[PDB]
Amino acid sequence: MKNILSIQSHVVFGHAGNSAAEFPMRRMGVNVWPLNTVQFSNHTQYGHWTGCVMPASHLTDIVQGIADIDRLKDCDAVLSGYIGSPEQGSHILAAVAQVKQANPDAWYFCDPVMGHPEKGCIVAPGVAEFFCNEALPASDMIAPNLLELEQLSGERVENVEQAVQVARSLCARGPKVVLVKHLSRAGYHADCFEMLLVTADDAWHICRPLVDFGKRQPVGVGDLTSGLLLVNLLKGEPLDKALEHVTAAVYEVMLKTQEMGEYELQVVAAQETIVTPICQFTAVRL
Amino acid sequence: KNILSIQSHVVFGHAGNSAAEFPMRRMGVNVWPLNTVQFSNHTQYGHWTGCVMPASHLTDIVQGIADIDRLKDCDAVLSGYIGSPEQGSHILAAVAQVKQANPDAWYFCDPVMGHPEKGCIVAPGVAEFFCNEALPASDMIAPNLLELEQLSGERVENVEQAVQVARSLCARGPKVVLVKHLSRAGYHADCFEMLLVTADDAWHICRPLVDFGKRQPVGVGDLTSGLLLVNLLKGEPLDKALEHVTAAVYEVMLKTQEMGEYELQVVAAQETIVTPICQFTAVRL
Ligand code: NA
Ligand code: NA
């Protein structure tokens, strides 16, 4: 069994962060050690929530506890997404460093969440700086959307050719794999959702139809995309097959959500189409 | 169907919510995991790191779900191991608030106190909490032989006595009693046995004993309790509900044993949770 230490938010009702990624990743047959950074009643896009943020020192305490039972060496990858403060981020990188000492083959998959290209930045002060100068150099894979790829590089990205080159420039600072999870305006077609998977030797481009949720877009699509890519890569899937599975599995969860008229991403109702999607999307090697 | 599950969370391994959440979601029921603690691993390792959530955090979370008008979607509240009477009283306040939002909601109480062979493991305040407070508020309970004797104050020597004592606990609140581990009160020392009791009927079931040596895997009771609530919420007949739970838990224990693991292998055994290969037949008494 492959084992992921996933350090993300937890919501009691609904799905976001670890609450969006844990059940789909376990459904695919990979273990998830869910190290919850918060415990909130619901995600923040309802405009109100109750609960609490865990002390940043709690995150490194947990990791020490797993090392104390000599199980930290079983961790094959660390996954991070939304980060509420630079202090929390520094403790997540301390967890990554501790895991790699116990297991030198462990990967750090960083979703550098900063916001949606259509809405703008939603991160707390200092978090953008933390991703650019701290998380990026320590990462083995990163999954920036267009807004995050531009923030991390400090460059405008206008098309796929540029996105590949800019992704390869971020790679030189640390990660070996870059997933441009949301191309946005830099894509080929305005009527299509697009993603790009980049390595040193290759780049794959993939397309799928847009899902119009209108005013209330469900939270967790990025969290699910990042988590499912990590699972496919840990399971030894070729990069093109990995991208194709993620693209179709996420799309099917989104369709199920819209069909049920729900605001929350329906990760449990769509579980059969997560492992075996009906929809098939094919990547194009650039 | 939606379950608000208020139990422990362990980052590595499986106990409490970490044992029950994935299997119940695998069965197609939603789980709202209200974690009472966040620990590095369960306490039977003999050491752990992490913390206990403040008891007021539990009722704070329930209010937040009521604030988004979603508490009415809750079909059941599930509880297991409780660390203190204070945590316990906040769990019952959560149950009362859910029942106000949804009068058809059930409270499933696993009254954990200890193992019938290893003995009690909770403070006496917690045993008093289950007898005085948790039992009158429950709709279903899943005591092992030790817990069934603690709640009734009577010695239970056999299945006939177990059925009578279970119905005596029902007059005190619950409509369904699962004697999750019969222990010495069972018919056969060589069999693992359980009993499902209602006002009109009682079902008995057996399955082989699984030998794990000195280190007994944690969470068997948590998984049993969780999977029974799922079967009842999905409207399974009581005999079919007992048969599925008995076989699905056994399959998880078989997978754990064949892998030589200490942790209950709830993810590796996921295919046999929904569709067990083993078949065990319940007998109506
Ligand atoms: Na596009
Ligand atoms: Na027996």
Curated annotation (Swiss-Prot), chain B:
Residue positions binding ATP: 110, 142, 147, 180, 207-210
Xref: CDD domains: pyridoxal_pyridoxamine_kinase
Organism: Yersinia pestis
EC number: 2.7.1.35
UniProt xrefs under Pfam families: Phos_pyr_kin
Names of the cofactor(s): Mg(2+)
Reactions it catalyzes: pyridoxal + ATP = pyridoxal 5'-phosphate + ADP + H(+)
Classification via InterPro entries: PM/HMP-P_kinase-1, PyrdxlKinase, Pyridoxal_kinase_PdxY, Ribokinase-like
Record protein name field: Pyridoxal kinase PdxY
Upper classification of the organism: Bacteria, Pseudomonadati, Pseudomonadota, Gammaproteobacteria, Enterobacterales
Keywords per UniProt: ATP-binding, Kinase, Magnesium, Nucleotide-binding, Transferase
Pathway per the UniProt entry: Cofactor metabolism; pyridoxal 5'-phosphate salvage; pyridoxal 5'-phosphate from pyridoxal: step 1/1
